[PDB]
Amino acid sequence: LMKPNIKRVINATGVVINTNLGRAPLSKDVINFISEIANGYSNLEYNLEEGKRGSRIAHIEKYLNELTGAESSFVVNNNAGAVFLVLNTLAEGKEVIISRGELVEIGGSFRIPDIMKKSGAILREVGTTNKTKVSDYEGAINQNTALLMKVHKSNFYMEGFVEEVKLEDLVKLGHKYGIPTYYDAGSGLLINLKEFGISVDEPNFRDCISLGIDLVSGSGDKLLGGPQAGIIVGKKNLIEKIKKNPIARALRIDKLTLSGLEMTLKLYFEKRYEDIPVIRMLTQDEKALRQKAKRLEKLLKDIPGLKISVIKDKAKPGGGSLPELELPTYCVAIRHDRLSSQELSRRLRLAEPPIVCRIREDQLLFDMRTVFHEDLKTIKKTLQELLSI
Amino acid sequence: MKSLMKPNIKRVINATGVVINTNLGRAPLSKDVINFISEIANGYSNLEYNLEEGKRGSRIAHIEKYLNELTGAESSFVVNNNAGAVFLVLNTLAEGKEVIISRGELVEIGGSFRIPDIMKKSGAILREVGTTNKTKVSDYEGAINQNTALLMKVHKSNFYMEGFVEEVKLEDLVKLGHKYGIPTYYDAGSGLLINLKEFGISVDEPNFRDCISLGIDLVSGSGDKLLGGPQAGIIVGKKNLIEKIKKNPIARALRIDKLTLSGLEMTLKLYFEKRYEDIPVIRMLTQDEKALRQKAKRLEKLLKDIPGLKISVIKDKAKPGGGSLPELELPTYCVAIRHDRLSSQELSRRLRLAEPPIVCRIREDQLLFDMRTVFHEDLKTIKKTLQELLSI
């Protein structure tokens, strides 16, 4: 093979946070900065003022602190690690209370009880799958309770007869017994969504911090729309213990992500949301989508055996973050006389660049939500090369 | 006390359009059944007797024949309620032993019923496997050991999950159980008797016959849910196991009453006779869309003459099963009413205080009557009830 296996793939699934397709894409502004810091040497671990070594995370935490309002903050390889670290540091040998309904598998390799076991912490599971009350948490408190933990169900959701302990209650319960409260938000949403005209209950750092939760973690590649990372924020007392754990060194973030992260956080401090693609995509205007949808169909009419439509559909745009959410978008629907849709999808994934699309009832769909403007021309040229042969 | 001069349990007209309603008494009974119940209650009977042999007999006997035939299990048994069945199954086969179950199937149904809580009081030992959202065969098999007494699956009747989710195919469980020689218990909960797709309602909901022929060793369910009968815990399965269960002294504490046994038998006989329309819970879920409309405009016809009354007829998607089919979404015709003098919040409040009461849905200060759960004899009574409240 002359070719590298890692390829740019055209996402037509209309799924913005896609665990399979590389999660959050990055803004050209961020990547340029990353590219700059990677092209030569730098002040990675250095103080230019004093002429000696300095802490790498230092640059970042300041932003996090003022953005989230938490006393201190830290960042490690990924949220998986965040969880592992937080547990291993605070709960080794001791008991961590958690709802039977928040023991989650995210991805293929991550399971709360599995990482938790490996951490050295002792799982104490309370309540039921579908309903969990405050009593259940309190009931399970004892001498060896180190931690009150909540995990946000980022990849799935429950409906029907359902209950859940209000975080406030959890903070309350924590304060009573003097037990720290750890919240794995996971989506790493930085700020309240309702500020962008998207009304959702999705917990963010800032808000769940000001709720009095002692520790909150999340990924950087999800709702934060940054590079992969485990983000931790909370009580300085705690973060301090965390940083000091030798394991934290094995979880230490790389130069690239660090740079990538800091640029991302600058954008947020400067309130330039449109400049982080996950946010832009999820707040894209319903008109902007039809405008894109029709723009593509204009390029598709001239090719043979091709049936082009454009529909309006309720999709669930956030894959690994906002599972409940349903938003309307415009899909460009296409069909060929000679080829079944399943056969076409298969060829599209094998194309260069590959094209991954949603199928509905033997009707091949491209959801514009997650398609770029530079992608359109490339789908034309890629469709004709397969079908005009 | 003053409120003692009259009974508190009253008939109540349900306009919530919610067929299986935990609050409003669950499944109503057909008059055929009620008559039969009334007949066996009115005097003495063969309850525990063998008229052939002139000596005492099992009460369950009457019923077991029907269940065994309908579901295709070797033997069957009936206790007070499904909670009890679950309690009894576990206390019989798993006391002091381990029961493997998915972390996603540890349910709270009702306020007072929690699998892990009752399983504990059961004497059984809970070995929970997998995760909330995803559970694989691996999880089940990996937790098997010397003290493993049971592989258990509980059907999520009152809630459901969406997103990244995994579940073990029943077939694989059975295959896993046959491998290690461990019995498999399915708490269906819904006690649905026959496949729903036969009535034009396409859903995955498990039924007795189908889950038995798949090689599950024990299946239980409620009587007053999708079975459309009176309250009961129904167990069907392998004779060797039913036997062990029947002999548990606790099963006498859970022994069913003359009334439900009667009601149950007639209910089942209706199933044998394939007269589904004569069991309200199935009739109400299988009602034709036209029929609902037909019924909705026949109501509107009666209410036009009432002063201050604005009346429309809408078409809406509702969720008819409360405690059995939470996913199921079905279209129905509601009859919507509005008054100029009374707020709908105040009008609903008065309707519940009526004789007979009337419970309906409220949506943005508009009052909804869902035709799904309204009987034909109830229309007239809604007219007379409204005019009495509004005119007076």
Ligand SMILES: [K+]
């Ligand atoms: K890294």
Ligand SMILES: [Pt+2]
């Ligand atoms: Pt009283």
Ligand SMILES: [Pt+2]
């Ligand atoms: Pt009195």
